[PDB]
């Protein structure tokens, strides 16, 4: 059972990577809370197609080279309420099925 752990007040790291097989051109990516559902993400935590209205103040960030397929999620200043399954989902254009990763985050008290 793969679980990713962070301690309260730290930043969590949830790895997520895809093959950038459509070069140069943007690729839909979502992250949400809960296992990946039928389509896209449930309970979306961040956007990758454009910057959110409160971009600067959000705790959710993609700090990797997402251009090169690193869409790993940072969750800043975690609390116990952050524990749960997260969905990372990528749709390379034309693909038969999205690639869907369910990532389990366990926050531990400080």
């Amino acid at each position, epitope marked *: 059972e793969v679980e990713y752990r962070a301690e309260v007040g730290q930043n969590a790291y949830l790895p997520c990577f895809y093959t950038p097989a459509a070069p140069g051109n*943007l690729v*839909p*990516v*979502c992250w949400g809370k*809960g296992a990946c*559902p*039928v*389509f*896209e*993400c*449930g*309970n*979306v935590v961040l*956007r*990758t*197609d*454009e910057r*959110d209205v409160n971009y600067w103040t959000s705790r959710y960030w993609l700090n990797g080279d997402f251009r090169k397929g690193d869409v790993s999620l940072t969750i800043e200043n975690v609390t116990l309420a952050d524990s749960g399954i997260y969905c990372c*989902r990528i*749709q390379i254009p034309g693909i038969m099925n*999205d690639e869907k990763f369910n990532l389990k985050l366990v926050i531990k008290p400080a």
Partner: antibody
Amino acid sequence: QLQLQESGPGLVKPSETLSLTCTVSGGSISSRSYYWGWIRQPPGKGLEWIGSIYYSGFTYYQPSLKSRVTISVDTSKNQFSLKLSSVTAADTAVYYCATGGPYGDYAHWFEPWGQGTLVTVSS
Amino acid sequence: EIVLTQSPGTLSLSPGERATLSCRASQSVSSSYLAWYQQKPGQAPRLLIYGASSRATGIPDRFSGSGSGTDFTLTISRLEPEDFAVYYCQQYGSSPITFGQGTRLEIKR
């Protein structure tokens, strides 16, 4: 309130491409946690989902139509569009655009809808 | 795909009575992810119920949805003449999204 409005030809020749546009007013077609769909209704028949595109760009299609269907968004114009190639009389229908959201959990009910536009495929 | 079969195909009831419309699925519909629509003549479908049992905003209390697994109902109590319409169910628990073929409800007089 969001309002949707279909536009495009009412008559298309067999083997040519059907193109429709949906213009969205009263809200942004790029708002988080919305999806935008095309659903058609042959005369006297029921409803068939054609496909949807999410605010984030994720697109999903009716499998039997995927090889012929393109759905895309123009955020500059607040419009989304449908192209259906190689049409036959099977594609005669009222075509609706529709939207759903804002969703928390995944959902894919539709409300509101456009008004519908009839396309007849005939020579 | 999940095929939705509505019954009866046509219904004719007096105002003030209760209509019970059935939607039955070829396989279990995940998470009660079933919606109901009302389609009046010449109009787009109007969402009544989502998630099997949640009323859409602006929909009167006399519309109710229930059911699970493969058997879902729409109930319209205290029928009114303006309830004449074709009613459709929709599932979104799996792709492709699918709809039933409709029940036509006539209001007697």
